[PDB]
Every structure is written in structure tokens, then in C-alpha cells.
Ligand binder design. Structure first.
Ligand SMILES: C[C@@H](O)[C@H](N)C(=O)N[C@H]1[C@@H](O)[C@H](n2cnc3c(N)ncnc32)O[C@@H]1CO
Ligand SMILES: C[C@@H](O)[C@H](N)C(=O)N[C@H]1[C@@H](O)[C@H](n2cnc3c(N)ncnc32)O[C@@H]1CO
Lengths: 138, 138
């Protein structure tokens, strides 16, 4: 897995158009103030263990989010972070599990729609730990 | 080289803190509207031909800018896109070259300062061609 964590003043998104692999979603729009925007590409290597990958992901998000003491998390699918991607079915599963585990761990979570073209607005805080990239293993 | 090209309503930035390799500059604050925000990671392979990499990158930016009829370009150093980076000195050279060549080809260019932690704000348009990733080889 590849992840970009952006410590943000806000993140808003608006689904605009479906791709062929668009997911049913219960929020085509969303806004979250002061958050860790986690842009995630679920990778082919992640298919070896999708459940372990979601745990590995939450573990790393916690590591950074505890270091910033942020409780607000956006799970934002972002395929462009990798050139060797997982299947859409597996990616959706991992992203949904990440949201589930984080919610279970008392985090405030917003998940952007998988497989939709989305307008978005983000403001990065710009401190030395405000943009971090992480490679994640199960 | 890895680039992510985002068709944006705006890109704004504010350099906040220096790193070890912060470039010396006056342009520490900036904004461009209706722009192609080009997040660029210069890679180890690019060291073999820095000028050629720059020319290749400009060619791809032009293809997208011409397809979307965009004239405003932001050159944004973004190491996060790649796990196999060139040296810092190589990276700034190539980024500076991309900026100078785009300028000589008639584009309005703003380059975000290299080696500074920066706050930034962006708004992605969200149409199907608004977020494109490209590998550049030279
Ligand atoms: C394009 C860009 O602007 C947009 N933001 C986009 O990335 N769209 C992707 C992801 O939301 C999702 N998707 C498919 N596979 C994956 C994967 N392995 N990991 C994460 N997302 C995936 O499906 C869309 C088309 O590939
Ligand atoms: C901090 C982070 O969130 C910020 N946004 C950042 O990416 N900072 C990078 C670039 O500005 C630049 N830089 C150094 N090497 C490279 C490279 N190979 N390619 C591109 N830029 C580089 O130097 C910084 C640290 O590597």
C-alpha cells in the first residue's frame, strides 16, 4: 500500500461523475475540518492479505495521527499514488475496513466515494509533519 | 520522473519553514488560478539525463495543457509521488528547467519554492481529465 497523509485545515469533496467501477456510496458530498487526509492506493502486493493491509494501514495512520494528536480522519481513495494497483473489489474492501477499524478506535472518519470523479478542496497546514508518505505492508 | 497534473480552480502556497536544502528565494508566497498544478517527483533514473527529463516533462505538460486549453502552470516539487528519488540538487535543477522551458514556450508559470515546508490550498475541478498521472523517462 502507498499512502499520503496530509494534515489539513479542511477537506471537502463532491462526486461529479461515475467511472465504470464506481461504488454505491451514502455520501456523494463531504466536508471535514482539521483532519488527517489519507490518500490511499491499495496495491497488488496488498491482495496477499487485504485484512492485514487494513490493520497495517490503521496502525500507521494512528502512529502519525497520535503524533499530531488529530482525531479527524479522511479516507480518500487515490489510485495515482501507485502504478501497481489492487483489484477494485479488494481496494473497496480495504478502504471500508480501514474506516471500520478507525471508527471502532474512536476516530472521527469520513470516506470519499470509490470510483467516482470528485472535485475536492484541501488546505495543508505546512508544518514539518504536515505531509507524510508511507509505504504499508500487511 | 513521476508527475501528478491537477486541473485546479486555484493553487496557493505559503513557505513556512526551511529544510537543510531550502532554495534561496524571494517568492515564498504565491497563487495561480485556473491552472494545471503539476506535482513533480524527480527520480533516480532522471540523474542520467536531467535536461532530457525536463524536456520530456514539458512535452507531457504541454499535451495536457493544450487538451484542456490551460495556460497557467504551477511547478510544485512533490517528492511524495516517488519512492526512488534523485538527489536534491538534481531535483531543483530539473524543476527550474521545466519552469524556464514552459516560460519560453508561452506558459504563465509559478514555481513553488524547493526545500521549504509549505502550507498550500488547492481546489481540483473533478472532471474526468482533472487528475492525471504521468511517468516521464527521457
Ligand atoms: C482518477 C483520480 O482523479 C481519482 N482520485 C481516483 O484515484 N480514482 C480511482 C479510485 O477512486 C478508484 N480505485 C480503483 N482502484 C483503486 C485502488 N487500488 N486504490 C485506490 N483507489 C482505487 O477507482 C477510480 C478509477 O481508478
Ligand atoms: C516536505 C514535503 O511535504 C514537501 N511537499 C516536499 O515534497 N518537499 C521536498 C521537495 O520540496 C524537495 N525535494 C527534494 N528532493 C526532491 C525530489 N527528488 N523531487 C522533488 N522534490 C524534491 O525537498 C523537500 C524534501 O525532500
Amino acid at each position: 500500500m502507498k499512502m499520503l497523509l496530509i494534515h489539513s485545515d479542511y477537506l471537502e469533496f463532491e462526486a461529479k461523475e461515475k467511472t465504470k467501477i464506481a461504488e454505491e456510496t451514502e455520501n456523494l458530498k463531504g466536508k471535514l475540518d482539521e483532519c488527517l487526509a489519507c490518500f490511499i492506493a491499495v496495491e497488488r502486493e496488498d491482495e496477499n492479505n487485504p485484512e492485514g493491509t487494513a490493520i497495517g494501514a490503521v496502525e500507521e495512520i494512528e502512529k502519525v495521527a497520535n503524533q499530531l494528536k488529530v482525531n479527524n480522519i479522511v479516507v480518500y481513495p487515490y489510485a495515482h499514488l501507485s502504478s501497481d494497483l489492487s483489484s477494485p473489489e479488494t481496494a473497496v474492501k480495504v478502504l471500508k475496513d480501514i474506516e471500520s477499524i478507525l471508527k471502532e478506535r474512536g476516530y472521527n472518519v469520513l470516506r470519499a466515494p470509490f470510483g467516482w470523479y470528485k472535485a475536492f478542496k484541501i488546505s495543508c497546514k505546512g508544518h514539518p509533519l504536515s505531509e507524510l508518505s508511507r509505504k504499508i505492508v500487511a
